[PDB]
Amino acid sequence: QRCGEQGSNMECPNNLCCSQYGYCGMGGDYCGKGCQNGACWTSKRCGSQAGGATCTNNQCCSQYGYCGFGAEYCGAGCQGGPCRADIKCGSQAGGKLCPNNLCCSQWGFCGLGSEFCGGGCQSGACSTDKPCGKDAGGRVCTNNYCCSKWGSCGIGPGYCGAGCQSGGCDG
Amino acid sequence: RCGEQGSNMECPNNLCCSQYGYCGMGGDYCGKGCQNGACWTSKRCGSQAGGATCTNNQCCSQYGYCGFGAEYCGAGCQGGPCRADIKCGSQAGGKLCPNNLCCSQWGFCGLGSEFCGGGCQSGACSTDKPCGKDAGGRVCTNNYCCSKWGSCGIGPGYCCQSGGCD
Ligand SMILES: *NC(=O)O[C@H]1O[C@H](CO)[C@@H](O)[C@H](O)[C@H]1NC(C)=O
Ligand SMILES: *NC(=O)O[C@H]1O[C@H](CO)[C@@H](O)[C@H](O)[C@H]1NC(C)=O
């Protein structure tokens, strides 16, 4: 019902600003001082300039560790985000995982869509619901996903709670 | 809550929002009934779908599908963080940036001091120009509400001289 800290780090639709009180809106009382995420007037930090932090709302982290959109952000020197340059991952990039749970295709590139998540998907939010756990021969999940008691990879109470076999299981 | 159950909000890091309005990964969240996020069955968009836009700041491909990667943000990219500069504003027939993106004083869509500062035309400009009676009866862009104190925005304190009022 709320957003941000007050709501499990939820993000407002269409880049609306989540203010300090965990509500979605637009304007100084939402994008001014104390703005959490969304189109905050004060660009949040990220990348190397911010201990490896990433950009919320799927924004682009410029080479100067600033979040946003446009050539100045997703262009040359884009360190994380929907950068304009192809982003290699997995086998062809030293195990490297895709940002924000993007599927790493068989050809070794991050993204979302059947091409990236369908047959051959190596990691991320793969559409290929590859089994895990005991009945899968002890197979574990990528991205440190929790392996439900039923033997399916994912995230959530039914995955990380009771019966959880591997991955970042509920402590 | 998220999706229909949470004022159409989205989960961070492209986490799918299930039909029951909860965020997560796996078949329970991305499979049958997915509302947004990295849904296994990608959402339709663009000219192929009544010019509807993509959630999670996903790019709409030349085939009307939401997602990321070259196939989506490359050539034919209809919406989202397309790789090809997106023209807008006075330099593009008064066109609006999708998803409240800032249209710079050069008529390109983006987010940052360059795109939302200075002569920002539309989108979520960080300039906040006054509106209404005390601003020559000025009107907010994007149908933004003009507060009873001359400030453009959305919400209760903004929705009210002009705009998407209540
Ligand atoms: N068709 C195809 O395989 O494209 C692949 O190769 C280029 C690299 O030159 C990438 O830009 C494409 O995005 C990549 N496609 C996928 C799905 O990874
Ligand atoms: N090859 C191809 O046409 O891919 C496209 O069509 C399928 C539907 O058959 C969709 O799954 C893909 O998302 C779509 N690819 C793109 C980039 O839209």
Q: CB–CB of B39/A169 below 8 Å?
A: no
Place of tokens 């929907």: A82
Long-range pairs for B121-128 at CB < 8 Å and ≥24 separation?
B121/B88, B121/B89, B121/B90, B122/B88, B122/B89, B122/B96, B122/B97, B123/A39, B123/B96, B123/B97, B124/A15, B124/A17, B124/A26, B124/A31, B124/A39, B124/A41, B124/B100, B126/A31, B126/A41, B126/A42, B126/B102, B128/A27, B128/A28, B128/B152
Fold of the A43-85 domain: Wheat Germ Agglutinin (Isolectin 2); domain 1 (3.30.60)
Which residues, in sequence order, are bridge partners of residue A45?
A66
Q: What residues does each domain of chain B span?
A: 1-41, 42-84, 85-127, 128-166
Of residues A88, A107, A106, the one with CA closest to residue A98? A88
| Rg of chain B over all Cα atoms, to the nearest angstrom | 18
Q: How far is CA B84 from CA A118, B1, B72, B119, in A?
A: 26, 35, 11, 22
Task: Give dist(CA B77, CA B73) in Å, integer.
Answer: 5
**B85-127: CATH homologous superfamily?**
Endochitinase-like (3.30.60.10)
Among the partner-chain residues B69, B102, B157, the one whose CB lies closest to the CB of A115 is: B69
Give domain B128-166's CATH number out of 1.10.645.10, 3.30.60.10, 1.10.10.10, 3.40.640.10: 3.30.60.10
Largest Cα separation within chain B, whole Å, is: 55
> Which atom of ligand 1 lies at the shortest distance from residue A108's CA?
18
Q: Ligand 1 pocket by C-beta < 6 Å: which residues?
A: A 86, 105, 107, 109, 115-116; B 69-71
Whether residues A27 and B57 touch (CB distance < 8 A) is answered with no
**A121 has binding-site annotation:** no
Q: Classify domain A129-171 at the CATH topology level.
A: Wheat Germ Agglutinin (Isolectin 2); domain 1 (3.30.60)
Q: Report domain B1-41's class.
A: alpha beta
Cα of B50 from ligand 2 centre, angstroms? 18
Residue A70 near residue B111 (C-beta atoms within 8 A):
yes
Q: Do B111 and A23 touch (CB under 8 A)?
A: no
CATH number of A86-128: 3.30.60.10, 3.30.70.260, 3.60.15.10, 2.40.50.100? Answer: 3.30.60.10
The answer regarding whether domain A2-42 maps to CATH 3.40.309.10 reads no
